[PDB]
Amino acid sequence: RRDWENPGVTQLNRLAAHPPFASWRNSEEARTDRPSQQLRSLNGEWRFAWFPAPEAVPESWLECDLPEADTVVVPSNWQMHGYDAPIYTNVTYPITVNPPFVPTENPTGCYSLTFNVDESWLQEGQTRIIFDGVNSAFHLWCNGRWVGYGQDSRLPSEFDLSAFLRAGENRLAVMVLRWSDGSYLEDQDMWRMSGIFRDVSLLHKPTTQISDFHVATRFNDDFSRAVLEAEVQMCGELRDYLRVTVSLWQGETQVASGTAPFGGEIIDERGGYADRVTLRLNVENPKLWSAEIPNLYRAVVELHTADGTLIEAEACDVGFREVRIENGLLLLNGKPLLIRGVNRHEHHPLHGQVMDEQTMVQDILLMKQNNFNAVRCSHYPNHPLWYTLCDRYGLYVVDEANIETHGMVPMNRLTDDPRWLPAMSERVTRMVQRDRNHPSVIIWSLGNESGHGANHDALYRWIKSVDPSRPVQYEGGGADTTATDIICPMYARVDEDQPFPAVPKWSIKKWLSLPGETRPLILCEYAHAMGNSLGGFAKYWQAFRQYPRLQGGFVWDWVDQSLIKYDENGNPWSAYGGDFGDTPNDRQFCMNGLVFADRTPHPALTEAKHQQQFFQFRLSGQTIEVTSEYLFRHSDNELLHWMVALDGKPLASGEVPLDVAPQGKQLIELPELPQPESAGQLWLTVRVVQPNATAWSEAGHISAWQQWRLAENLSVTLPAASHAIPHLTTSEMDFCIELGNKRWQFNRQSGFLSQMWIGDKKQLLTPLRDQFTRAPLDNDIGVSEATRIDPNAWVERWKAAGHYQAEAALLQCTADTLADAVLITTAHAWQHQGKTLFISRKTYRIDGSGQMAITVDVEVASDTPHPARIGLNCQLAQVAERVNWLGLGPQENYPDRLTAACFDRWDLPLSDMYTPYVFPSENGLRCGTRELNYGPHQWRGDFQFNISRYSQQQLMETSHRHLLHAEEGTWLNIDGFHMGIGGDDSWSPSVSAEFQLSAGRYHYQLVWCQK
Amino acid sequence: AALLQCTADTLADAVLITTAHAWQHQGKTLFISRKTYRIDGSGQMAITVDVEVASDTPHPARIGLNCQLAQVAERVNWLGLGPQENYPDRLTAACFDRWDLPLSDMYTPYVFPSENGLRCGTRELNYGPHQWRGDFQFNISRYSQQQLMETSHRHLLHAEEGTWLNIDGFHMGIGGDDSWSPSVSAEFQLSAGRYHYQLVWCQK
């Protein structure tokens, strides 16, 4: 029996699913959520042996430990211990597509544990074992006797061991198969791992026990009154003396309580459920739960005899909230939500797919700190503690069935097949049975990228029947099928339609109004944050705020799935697809995170924070209008800090309390401000600061900001005449200009500034020359590969047009000495195989003060692909500690990703001017810069720049950040213009037209001077 | 206009004039215009214009130069968008080609007079013996902008001596979503703060 090659067999002897149990035998412990002596953890050191196929495991292992086994920690994924390689594949399955069969070489993990059981557990009641996560399928033996089997890598499998155990020492044997028929439903875009990767526990329940319970909360029209209804089911000895008492607590106060014997209402001609009871508790003015204020009550479910003996108690946290879609809007407690969401896979760079409390808390803190209020469990039910944490800290959750068959062709081949209805049904029904009482879960999802099959329609209806309290969504088959209550596309653009046949991705604004459509639209995935991305993010937020039925979306995704590898010297480095010998693989497609694998933010995180702010600001005169986007709370932990500065020089600042009701406005009249007469632009910057620490943030946390230009005094003052005049010396090969301690050398053959001296020290390692290209970003490459070029990708268009290899041809190079300066004029043409792609005309004016004014005018052929940038570059000889600029910052910012940046005076260590994206590319740009200072140099103009120890050539040629090497000196790229980075998706061109350099003619000017 | 600078330099084959001016109002500088005029041995005069517009002043209607030419010629010939009047937010119907019309066709007789007759996207303009090359928008007519703004009805306009030529590096859109509230879309307002344009005036 190859049960792992039969979708008709998804378990053997497995117990029914139910919500979290702990079988407390004391009600106060259940009320306080203290640990239960009846729920033990079997996590720790286990014994493990790897085999290449199930046929290789020896019979002896059922009864005795294998000498050659190792001791390892469980939970774990065995690839993380090095027994075999993790595989990174996106769409294409990791095994041959031949359902329901899997490879005969099927890595098999033999786990075993010798553990204790106290006789007391065996004198009465039932002892079960619980495996919260085993990937992908497994057989279980206890004391050498076969117990059962399970599939579905992401939900708990439980077995009754009552009849198999003995007092004292017992031994478990778990044979885990890497591949099974369940793998056809587990093709999510992530590392393919295996093992006992979630907790293992032993739970003692009494013979007469609570076998399931469901909590519902219904409200009156204004939410001032609610009824809590709790349906409780029992298994075991049914007798009239039994009762259930459900009590509801708010802290130490008992708010309501009801007791009843078993026996539910008559439901049909054969009667009712003699083994169930429904308690209804009235609760006046309940404290409501939301992500803004996660108010919770504690429901304790006591199973007891009427005369007072507690048999056992179970319990849960309850959040009073109503989720309903009405008139096309998704409402929470009667108000329309605005989903500031993110998709989050369970990933740790050292532990793989094993989740730990610290990591989950670290993730929720950072999410909330960055203005997220919702998370989608892409693409499977999560470790159970996740839900508890979202209930308590307050995040809206989309709980998703572990069903993804992306690699099938067509994508609904299995989901439309009734033979796969049974395996799919279990992944949906068992998730609902387990997670239906958590208030954080607000929407159920039927899985991901499995097309649209009749099995989705059947399952949509199942959930709508069993749980009317939450909408059900599902994106497959075109995002607006009959199996979804919410239009939930992935990567639909704001304004641009992408009319693919069958499953078009309409502009989200257009999609809402298609003939006959009325549902709300919340993207299940948008803003693919792969590498240097998040370009256009603000476009989505402006739309969400303007259109009521556009209720947000979930960014893809939270954290890069990079894994740690160690080099010869034993230093850690971030690996991606193929780095473990895995092939085929999808390379860096596993890193799409707002944060690196160790939780350090990528620069895009601050853009998300800012666009997701909960306060909107308008300025009129010196009156600030603050509007709150909270739906339920007043701004009771917030103050507004304001500062006025003249181009970086602070002039005045203050603080004012913010007191704005949800959806309300507050007007703030600022003080008679700073009105300087000196040149420069005045600017107002406001920040919302939370004075008090919270569960998720420290005191002084900044939650929102905004900046505006106030008055501008243009400079009309004339520089003093200089007491000098540069001298020019000419040779056939060069133009040399000298002025005091300074010297400039222009090569007449190449037409560029080849060297500059200060004091008598050389300043350049490479000449100053025009640059029209960039080391391609993930979004510029998309899915292109050398074995399979994608000619539509930006990088491929640039390559084919010759941008990377065009050579400068000199058309003119002259020198003139003026009254007080020397003027160098040049013109160059860049061509490729006959074609003139760009023309650069410039003047260099060096005056008696030592300043060099550079004016550049470029022409770009209308028929060549728009270039990545229009700028100059050079390798400076100096390496300095800091970079100080007056411009946008302080973090990396690009034209379509700079809303979060503020114009000010910034000063950072050189290293901060480089963003260590795992897959190297153009990075660290800062835009809107008016003055840049590095060592003895100052550059002034209105440009964008980056500066670092790595050339664009080096970044484009190196596949991993740890292989980069600082070059001599510092490479400076200063651009008049730079293309958008895009990111609406990372597999088709996504830079919006307005961010492409298509103007044909460009002008920029800089002044390079000393100090 | 207040002068900030006016210098002259001779180069190997040309003379270079450099000027800078500020436009001010009640002590605030509204616009700064920096230019170079380079006159070569070919008789061509290359004009480069770099303008600054204070961020807190309302976005200006246009950024260009103007003059009243002494002569009057019968035709206007240009390589640009046409043949009819077109403005930035209303130029989709125009085509880029070589157009030649009588001067009067370059004036649109709106009953209530205003700025009119612009053609955008022009790379070359010919009038009389003169030729202007660059990438600009222009209007040319017997009526000054001053007259147009002071005159309420077209029948009261009178041809001035010569020809008024307005040549714009940039021009604001005209709007029209309605005619009782500001309707020029953001993308058609001159809000960039710094603007550059260049032209060559030469003799044909």
Ligand SMILES: OC[C@H]1O[C@@H](O)[C@H](O)[C@@H](O)[C@H]1O
């Ligand atoms: O990085 C590509 C992303 O593509 C989406 O289509 C998918 O649902 C995600 O799981 C992820 O694969």
Ligand SMILES: OC[C@H]1O[C@@H](O)[C@H](O)[C@@H](O)[C@H]1O
């Ligand atoms: O003083 C610097 C400032 O100059 C203003 O003209 C500009 O609008 C601002 O963005 C900033 O560059």
Ligand SMILES: [Mg+2]
């Ligand atoms: Mg099976």
Ligand SMILES: [Mg+2]
């Ligand atoms: Mg009691």
Ligand SMILES: [Mg+2]
């Ligand atoms: Mg006993």
Ligand SMILES: [Mg+2]
């Ligand atoms: Mg997929």
Ligand SMILES: [Mg+2]
């Ligand atoms: Mg590959």
Ligand code: NA
């Ligand atoms: Na909305």
Ligand code: NA
């Ligand atoms: Na991915």
Ligand code: NA
């Ligand atoms: Na407050």
Ligand code: NA
């Ligand atoms: Na690279």
Ligand code: NA
């Ligand atoms: Na008028």
